[PDB]
């Protein structure tokens, strides 16, 4: 496949050969293609040009001149009669419809998550009781979800509305905000693993280290990707993929999912062990409930389609993957906010006390 720029370039090269170039009928064909001759009063019989992208090259133009070498003109006063109408019987509504469908699904899902997460961030910030290293990372994770969503909206606005600076800025921010959200999920998983499996903690050091890892490292990967893109291709917007360089950002994000998945299984192991030590159907119920609540936090749903390479759009696997990810990824923030802020016992108790005191004072 070749892009619009290539077609513009190839056409210029095509017309260049036109310049470097019954009766023969002389050039009586067009001003775009470059078979400048009408053949000796016969059907031109030139195959459909292969320099055009698809054009069903196996076909023929079947241009003709007659009488004794003259074109057959003025049917309804038309001129330069041509026969390649059957050659252009080739090649989109289906792809656009599903693209729009995916757009509406994740836009709605992201919107609800933003509203839920914003209420969650405000709740955690206002109450001083909830201020804790666990809650600081939760606020960082909740925020990262917000910047991820708003940037996607910003990217959609720029794209829907040619290598301008604003287009690049929107794309790079979207990737950086996507990466930080993924790593902050890993940070939460790593933080939980450290708590359970380590007998000593240093909040002053680990908290800052986790914050730097969550924020700084994705920026480095975006920075190196931006530097590579600018100094290697630097063609139009970065919306298109020029090759394997996309793996600069994709691979580290995927590397995080497996590590988080491994930690998730390990965390389930200790849950299955401790409940076994304290005793049954109830134990299974708690373990299953504990697994479900922790699933959205650890991003377990990402593992289903982690290792899938680029599949063609017109395929069942591609369709199910996009619907699956664009639904759960969008609503992951909403689920996390519900479980860990709205359903949190401490938050509920804190809200109840403040409301009761405010009502009593009023």
């Amino acid at each position: 496949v070749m892009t619009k720029e290539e077609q513009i370039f190839l056409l210029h090269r095509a017309q260049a050969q036109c310049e470097k170039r019954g009766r023969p009928c002389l050039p009586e064909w067009d001003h775009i293609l470059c078979w400048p001759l009408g053949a000796p009063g016969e059907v031109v019989a030139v195959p459909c040009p292969d320099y055009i992208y698809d054009f069903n090259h196996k076909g023929h133009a079947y241009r003709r001149c007659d009488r004794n070498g003259s074109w057959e003109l003025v049917p309804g006063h038309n001129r330069t009669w041509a026969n390649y109408s059957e050659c252009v019987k080739f090649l989109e509504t289906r792809e656009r419809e599903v693209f729009d469908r995916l757009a509406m699904i994740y836009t709605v899902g992201y919107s609800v998550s933003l509203a839920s997460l914003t209420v969650a961030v405000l709740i955690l910030a206002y109450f001083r009781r909830l201020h804790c290293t666990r809650n600081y990372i939760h606020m960082h994770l909740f925020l990262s979800f917000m910047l991820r969503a708003v940037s996607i909206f910003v990217k959609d606005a720029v794209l829907y509305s040619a290598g301008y600076a604003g287009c690049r800025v929107a794309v790079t921010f979207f990737l950086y905000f996507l990466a930080t959200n993924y790593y902050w999920i890993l940070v939460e998983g790593l933080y939980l693993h450290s708590l359970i499996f380590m007998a000593f903690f240093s909040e002053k050091k680990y908290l800052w280290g986790f914050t730097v890892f969550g924020w700084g490292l994705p920026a480095v990967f975006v920075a190196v990707w931006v530097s590579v893109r600018a100094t290697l291709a630097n063609t139009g917007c970065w919306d298109l993929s020029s090759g394997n360089k996309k793996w600069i950002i994709q691979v580290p994000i995927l590397a995080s999912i497996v590590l988080n998945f491994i930690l998730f299984i390990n965390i389930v192991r200790v849950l299955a062990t401790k409940l076994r030590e304290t005793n049954t159907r109830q134990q299974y119920r708690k373990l299953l409930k504990s697994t479900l609540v922790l699933m959205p936090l650890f991003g377990v749903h990402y593992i289903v389609f982690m290792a899938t390479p680029y599949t063609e759009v017109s395929g069942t696997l591609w369709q199910v993957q996009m619907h699956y990810e664009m639904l759960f990824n969008s609503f992951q923030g909403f689920f996390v906010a519900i479980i860990y802020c709205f359903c949190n016992g401490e938050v509920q108790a804190e809200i109840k006390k403040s409301w009761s005191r405010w009502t009593l004072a009023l």
Binding site: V1, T3, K4, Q7, D30, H31, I32, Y53, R79, T80, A82, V88, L91, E92, E95, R96, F99, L102, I152, K155, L159, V171, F174, L175, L178, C237, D239, L240, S241, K246, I249, Q250, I253, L254, F305, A307, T308, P309, Y310, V313, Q321, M322, E325, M326, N329
Partner: protein, 34 residues
């Protein structure tokens, strides 16, 4: 692979094809009007 990036690349190819196809469509009219 990362889905959001993959969707972004698909959109670029889809929109670029539309520009090419619409470019072909208007060229078809111009030659028909030649």
């Amino acid at each position: 692979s990362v889905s959001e990036i993959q969707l972004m690349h698909n959109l670029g190819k889809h929109l670029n094809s539309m520009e090419r196809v619409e470019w072909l469509r208007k060229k078809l009219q111009d030659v028909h009007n030649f």
